Write a protein that binds this DNA or RNA. Sequence first.
RNA 1: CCCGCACAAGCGGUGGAGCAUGUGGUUUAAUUCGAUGCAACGCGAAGAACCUUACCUGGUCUUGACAUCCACGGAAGUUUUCAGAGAUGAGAAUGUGCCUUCGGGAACCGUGAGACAGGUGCUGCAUGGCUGUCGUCAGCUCGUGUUGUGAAAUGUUGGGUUAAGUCCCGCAACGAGCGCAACCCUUAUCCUUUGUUGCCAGCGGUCCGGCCGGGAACUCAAAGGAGACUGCCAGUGAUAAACUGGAGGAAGGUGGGGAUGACGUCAAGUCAUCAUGGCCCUUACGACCAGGGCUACACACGUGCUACAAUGGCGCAUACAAAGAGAAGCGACCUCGCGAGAGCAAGCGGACCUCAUAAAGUGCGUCGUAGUCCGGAUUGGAGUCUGCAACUCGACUCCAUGAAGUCGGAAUCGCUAGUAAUCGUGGAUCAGAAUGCCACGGUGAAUACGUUCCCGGGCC
Lengths: 99, 206, 115, 127, 98, 12, 84, 100
Amino acid sequence: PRRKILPDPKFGSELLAKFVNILMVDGKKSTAESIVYSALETLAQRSGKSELEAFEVALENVRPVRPVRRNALAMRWIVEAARKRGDKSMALRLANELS
Amino acid sequence: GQKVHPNGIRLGIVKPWNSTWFANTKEFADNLDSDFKVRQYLTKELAKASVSRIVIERPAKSIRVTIHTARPGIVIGKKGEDVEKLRKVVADIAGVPAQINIAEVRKPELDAKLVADSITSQLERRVMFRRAMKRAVQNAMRLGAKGIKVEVSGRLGGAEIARTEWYREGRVPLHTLRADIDYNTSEAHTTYGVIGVKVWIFKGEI
Amino acid sequence: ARIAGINIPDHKHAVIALTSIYGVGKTRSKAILAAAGIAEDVKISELSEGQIDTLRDEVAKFVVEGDLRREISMSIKRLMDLGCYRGLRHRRGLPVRGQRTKTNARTRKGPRKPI
Amino acid sequence: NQYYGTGRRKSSAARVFIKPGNGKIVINQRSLEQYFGRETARMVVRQPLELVDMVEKLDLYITVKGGGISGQAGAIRHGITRALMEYDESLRSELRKAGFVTRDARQVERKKVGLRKARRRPQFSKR
Amino acid sequence: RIRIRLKAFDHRLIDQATAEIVETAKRTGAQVRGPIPLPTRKERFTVLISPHVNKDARDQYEIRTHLRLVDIVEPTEKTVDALMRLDLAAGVDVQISL
Amino acid sequence: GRVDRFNKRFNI
Amino acid sequence: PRSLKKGPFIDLHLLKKVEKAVESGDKKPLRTWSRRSTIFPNMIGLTIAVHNGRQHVPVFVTDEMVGHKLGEFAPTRTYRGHAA
Amino acid sequence: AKQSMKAREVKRVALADKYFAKRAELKAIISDVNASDEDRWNAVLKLQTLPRDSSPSRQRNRCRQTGRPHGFLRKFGLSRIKVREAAMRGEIPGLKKASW
RNA sequence: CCCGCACAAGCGGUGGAGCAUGUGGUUUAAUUCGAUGCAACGCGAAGAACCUUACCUGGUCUUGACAUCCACGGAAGUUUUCAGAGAUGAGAAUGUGCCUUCGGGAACCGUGAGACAGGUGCUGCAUGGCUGUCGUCAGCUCGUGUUGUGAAAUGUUGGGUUAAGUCCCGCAACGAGCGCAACCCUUAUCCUUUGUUGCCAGCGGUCCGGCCGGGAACUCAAAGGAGACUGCCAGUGAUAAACUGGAGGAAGGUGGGGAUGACGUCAAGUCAUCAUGGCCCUUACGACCAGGGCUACACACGUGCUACAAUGGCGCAUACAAAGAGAAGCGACCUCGCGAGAGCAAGCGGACCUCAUAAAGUGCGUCGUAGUCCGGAUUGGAGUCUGCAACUCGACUCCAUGAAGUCGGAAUCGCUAGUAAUCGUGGAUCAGAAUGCCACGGUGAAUACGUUCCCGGGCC
Ligand SMILES: CN(C)[C@@H]1C(O)=C(C(N)=O)C(=O)[C@@]2(O)C(O)=C3C(=O)c4c(cc5ccc(CN6CC(F)C6)cc5c4O)C[C@H]3C[C@@H]12
Ligand SMILES: [K+]
Ligand SMILES: [K+]
Ligand SMILES: [K+]
Ligand SMILES: [K+]
Ligand SMILES: [K+]
Ligand SMILES: [K+]
Ligand SMILES: [K+]
Ligand SMILES: [K+]
Ligand SMILES: [K+]
Ligand SMILES: [K+]
Ligand SMILES: [Mg+2]
Ligand SMILES: [Mg+2]
Ligand SMILES: [Mg+2]
Ligand SMILES: [Mg+2]
Ligand SMILES: [Mg+2]
Ligand SMILES: [Mg+2]
Ligand SMILES: [Mg+2]
Ligand SMILES: [Mg+2]
Ligand SMILES: [Mg+2]
Ligand SMILES: [Mg+2]
Ligand SMILES: [Mg+2]
Ligand SMILES: [Mg+2]
Ligand SMILES: [Mg+2]
Ligand SMILES: [Mg+2]
Ligand SMILES: [Mg+2]
Ligand SMILES: [Mg+2]
Ligand SMILES: [Mg+2]
Ligand SMILES: [Mg+2]
Ligand SMILES: [Mg+2]
Ligand SMILES: [Mg+2]
Ligand SMILES: [Mg+2]
Ligand SMILES: [Mg+2]
Ligand SMILES: [Mg+2]
Ligand SMILES: [Mg+2]
Ligand SMILES: [Mg+2]
Ligand SMILES: [Mg+2]
Ligand SMILES: [Mg+2]
Ligand SMILES: [Mg+2]
Ligand SMILES: [Mg+2]
Ligand SMILES: [Mg+2]
Ligand SMILES: [Mg+2]
Ligand SMILES: [Mg+2]
């Protein structure tokens, strides 16, 4: 013009809470949360690395710019990419995009 | 632009209602219509008697009308003959027992309705609009108004092109809700059509 | 598999499969299966020929397929021959149930015909 | 001998009674798990206790009315926070720092004439 | 019990009228369950203000109906007499129930 | 059709 | 449509006019403005001239018309195409 | 509104009052479940012989000051325009400009 | 040099589809009239089957549908018949009051005459009133003084600062008015008072239902108060106004939202709300009636709704609102009906009763990317209800049908937070007839580096 998020319940991260918000449509946060956690479980089991750590792996490869905006664009690009995919559910589409 | 009605915006802040009765929906519209007819009757009947305000209370089933007049004598008449004629007609049109009380307006030059009606009387007699306005302003300020505005609009002096003219003296702070602004209007029916008069009189805050 | 002269999809739940018949919607499908004593979620592939024969008996109680198409055609022809208002709307290819035609009415009129 | 706090959020109001106990929480005669399906809402309710480290030191008896799941969870958190400050006034500064002492005063903005919602304006065609 | 329900469009008037009732009862030597303020009804009206068109130009008006309940336990002999012989201010509706 | 449709759904 | 419990609506003036035409065996068209009247079995074979807003349209009543309103056979709007 | 249009409404109110009981009787028969088919039929025929203006559904609420047939408010018996004029002069008890 | 969802950054749309709705056009006997770039086009209309209704066709009336005046007959009326589409004609019954000076009037109906009535006829470019608009933008002025031959100027510019002609400082100006701000409503915290129809902490009881005794705590109700001041502290600042940060506090710098619209601008809108100068019609441009039309459909535009699915559809189970309405009304329970509904019939002019399942949500199951278990247009059949009456032209239900549509070119719109988005709920108008309008909660984001650019505006 001319002239803060809270942490997620299951993990305690402002990064993942922001990711949930970026995924969310129409104020349906509980729906978005269930997708993100379902996706992170898939992602953690595949590598054997933890959900929160496996999230950072995917971000660092996507991040393009001020550090806050780097995360924002990366998360926005992951979600946009995952929605464009043709896998069965968003959780799987998201896990496949993150992996 | 357009302005809020000065009286309306101050109702229940510094300005009383002119009708004070409770009713449920069943009787509300009928009471409004009987009030309308009472005021219509009294306004016509007392056109020469300087009526400023007709307040209507409905105690019990009856009606109590308070007529604010600069001329209580003409309204009352000899031994209350005239006020009795009014009372019987009001009782008939209201369809309930009627009381008429008279309240004197001590200072007519500070009463917006009487000032407006004074100007429209003069305009109908072909007094120069500028003279009528100037004297209304001068009188109010002499009698201790903190301010006064007068507006006249229409075919002033029978001109083909209508215009608005106004004069103010002192303060007329219309955005101050605690300001006692007496506002009222009147229409002069001239040979060339309707001239509208608006009068705002400021009598101090609170 | 084959009912009322059409092939019903083998992979679908019976309740959905039977709606492939012209004249059977969801309500009649459920009623047919309730009467035959067949569960709604059984796949048509999983049914025996005896079970399919009972489905054919239940469907036979309804006017369906070519018998229904001819009833509907006859009903519309009757209106058109009568020359009642609805008949005239059918003749002219316009909405028959009072809908606006100043705009819309594209389902009946088809795509826009440039002036 | 119990400690009380009223909490409010959106259109919800929570009555929170705290006593010494073993970590029991009842909300409207139901358990926390039974009352709130959402784990976000369960987290919100338990935030003040977890922050002061009194999760199994206290029994909570809670009633809540009005608003929705998030409103009620937020009202309860506000009520617990105020009950804890009755129980021990020295907890104020920590609870204050966590943002729990504030009554979140954000309410639904009224619909307005000429707008579809509080702010959403009808669409404009220029030409 | 005498139950008295008062209604008015102005709260100052209704509070004057309740104060009259309680004193009338507490003079006649009657127990009164003191004025209960029941929910104010807010009836709202939205009107177009132009004579023609200008659909977004409106005024919004309200009538607030204030409501008070007074309950007279153990009505004495001249308790009911003094309440039925009372002209409350014009603009207060009074409903007495037995 | 219509005459016996009529006479059965109504009556004087 | 009209509730079955109330029966079919007919204007009394038309009912009496129909009864008189049937009893007489009269074959002159019955002029009516009662577009809203239901066609009854005893109208079969009569010509009913039904108002359409400006003229009385002759409707020769047949068995298939029974249960329809008279106005159904007397269109009120004139339309011959835009491009004609 | 024209003087004639205001007079039509007075006529409709008067006819509706004159026939209210008769219309109610006839409609009770037509609706009556255990009424005979002949009695139902005769009632249907009788109801339509009464003046159409005796039906209350023929009445249009009009502003009691001007006769305006649109913008009516039943609480006040006035159109939106006359409500506003009366409201601002303090002639409608309790009514004031609302904000919330 | 500044400002505003003006752009940028974002999120969701419109533009494509079907449907709703308004408009243009065309058509028509008539498709009544008005609104027209922003600021007309879900606008007047908060609700056209009849009525409404202003239009058309045809049938009718002429001092009249609606007033006053005069005269001559009648009480009022009510029941009832025939003819007629009805308007309206003919009848036939019955009734014969109330003021009683028992003089007569008062109603209230008829009839006659004419002063008149009547007009949604014209002129919004003769007007009042009311409204839109620039714009809630920060402006617009005046007195006195001074300057200039004068139109004019100064003040009001300038140095800082503000949301602000806001405030400070300087200054041939000194003051003032209308605006800004404040006073008003609402929302966020607390206290006091009152405590049912609301409340249930403790206690006794209990069929487990605040259900009962009670209790007055708490939620809540609604009256009265308290509270926020840049007040405190720090740094910046011109020993300024102010700014940035901190403390405490429910709240912090206009806390959030509303009401509030300066001088004026557009001969802007409205003679069809009403009023009104002038003009015009008067056995018609007035008035009554039935039927039709305002719902027409090669087409074009605007505003919406519903979608195109899996962050979803369907089934079963199960949570959590607010605000509002109600007597020619809201209508429970119970019974009947697949259902719309029907029958019976409590309660409630309401913190009591009723409308009245909140829905999204959550759990479990199923569908498995298909024009589908997506979509729900269209059409057939059968019904319900309101209403004299649903053919033209109602809403709703059931069975059947199952269109386009696979996220929409150029372009373009809204929004800065409890907002957008999404989810239900209520109300006015209203017999019936919302996807519109007005209102209410639930869930609840993204992004803003910046002012170069586009639009509107302010100051020099
Ligand atoms: C609506 N639009 C066609 C025009 C418009 O957009 C404007 C505008 N400013 O944007 C108008 O001013 C307008 O709406 C309007 O109001 C007009 C008039 O008022 C107007 C106009 C011309 C006139 C010429 C003559 C007369 C005299 N009358 C006719 C004769 F018989 C006696 C009146 C006029 C008039 O009132 C211009 C329009 C333009 C409009
Ligand atoms: K149509
Ligand atoms: K004007
Ligand atoms: K000067
Ligand atoms: K019609
Ligand atoms: K729509
Ligand atoms: K599912
Ligand atoms: K389908
Ligand atoms: K219809
Ligand atoms: K689109
Ligand atoms: K309705
Ligand atoms: Mg099928
Ligand atoms: Mg179906
Ligand atoms: Mg329609
Ligand atoms: Mg909302
Ligand atoms: Mg209520
Ligand atoms: Mg008139
Ligand atoms: Mg109506
Ligand atoms: Mg942009
Ligand atoms: Mg489109
Ligand atoms: Mg038009
Ligand atoms: Mg015009
Ligand atoms: Mg006109
Ligand atoms: Mg223009
Ligand atoms: Mg709109
Ligand atoms: Mg009509
Ligand atoms: Mg006849
Ligand atoms: Mg005229
Ligand atoms: Mg103009
Ligand atoms: Mg200036
Ligand atoms: Mg100032
Ligand atoms: Mg202000
Ligand atoms: Mg003009
Ligand atoms: Mg005129
Ligand atoms: Mg007609
Ligand atoms: Mg229309
Ligand atoms: Mg489906
Ligand atoms: Mg409802
Ligand atoms: Mg296709
Ligand atoms: Mg697809
Ligand atoms: Mg903004
Ligand atoms: Mg909605
Ligand atoms: Mg400025």
